Every structure is written in C-alpha cells, then in structure tokens.
C-alpha cells in the first residue's frame, strides 16, 4: 500500500498520515484523492469506532448528517492486499460495488474482511505510515447510539482537514 500519494488527515485527536497504493487500487485511490482534493472530508467524522476492530469515517458531519457522495466505485478487494492492522479500506454495503466516500482503518488484523471464497471482501487501498497511535486512541473514545447508528463517539472525532501532501 505504497502506490505513491500521501494524505494527511488532521483530526481533533491527532494526525494520521496515509500512503495510498495507486498500483494495486487505482480506482479506490483516485476516488479517495478526488474526495480529499475537493474538501469533501473536511468536517466529516469517524462515526463508527470499535476497539480491537476498526474506526470508520468520511460520511457524516458532527450532527450525524450524511454528505451526498459521488457515484459508487468498483470493488478492488481482489488486488491481493489484506486488511491487516494499519491498513485503510473502503466501507460499503451489501453490494460489493457500493463503496463511495466512507473508509475505515484496521486497528487489528481483520482477516474476515479479506477477499475470499465466502465473500468478495473489503478493498484495501493504503496503509497508515504515521499516526497509528492516534487511530488506536480514536478507537477507544467513549461511544453511544445515535439514530440507527451504533458505536458513535459521544464527543465527535472530527476530520478538520484532509490534504494530499507534496
């Protein structure tokens, strides 16, 4: 997951730097970079946090309002990258080709999320090169239920800015 692009996510809990795998996840990387470059992720939150599993964000505001994303992309989970601790992957629904803006960072080795004979899996497209301790921190913030959502941080963890680094 070192395709080339580096992205810095500055959150209210600290900074996380990512290196995206443009070679193995071209579509996922272009989709992600397009969102960051457009300023889409600014003011979105990590709305789903589960210790020992992952932290997911990039879709809702602090008031749990969902931002209208761009059209869904094809699933690249069969690119051979695994959902090991420290990787970034695309969140999606039942349809394997339903990913849009939401992504999650694995804070544990989640092999059950990998492309396999039982399910297409979740597309990994990068890795955290800096800030894993921050991701761990975010994963353990107190949470509660908001609407149909569970594991929502009681105190929103906001992505104040997302930028492609030089």
From Swiss-Prot:
GO terms for biological process: protein folding. Its main location: periplasm. It comes from the Bacteria. The keyword Secreted does not apply. It catalyses: [protein]-peptidylproline (omega=180) = [protein]-peptidylproline (omega=0). Disulfide bonds: none annotated. It is an enzyme of class 5 (isomerase). Residues 3-164 form the PPIase cyclophilin-type domain. Keywords: Isomerase, Periplasm, Rotamase, Signal. PPIases accelerate the folding of proteins. It catalyzes the cis-trans isomerization of proline imidic peptide bonds in oligopeptides. This is Peptidyl-prolyl cis-trans isomerase A. It comes from Escherichia coli O157:H7. The lineage of its organism: Bacteria, Pseudomonadati, Pseudomonadota, Gammaproteobacteria, Enterobacterales.
């Amino acid at each position: 997951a070192k395709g080339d692009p580096h992205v810095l996510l500055t959150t209210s809990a600290g900074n996380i730097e990512l290196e995206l795998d443009k070679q193995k996840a071209p579509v996922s990387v272009q989709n992600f970079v397009d969102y960051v470059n457009s300023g889409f992720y600014n003011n979105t939150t990590f709305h789903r946090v589960i210790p020992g599993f992952m932290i997911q964000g990039g879709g809702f505001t602090e008031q749990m309002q969902q931002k209208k994303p761009n059209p869904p992309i094809k699933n690249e989970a069969d690119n051979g990258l695994r959902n090991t601790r420290g990787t970034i992957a695309m969140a999606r629904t039942a349809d394997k080709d339903s990913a849009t803006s939401q992504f999650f960072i694995n804070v544990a080795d989640n092999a059950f999320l990998d492309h396999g004979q039982r399910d297409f899996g979740y597309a990994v497209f990068g890795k955290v090169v800096k800030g894993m301790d921050v991701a761990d921190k975010i994963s353990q913030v107190p949470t509660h239920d908001v609407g149909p959502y569970q594991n929502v941080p009681s105190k929103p963890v906001v992505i104040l800015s997302a930028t492609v680094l030089p």
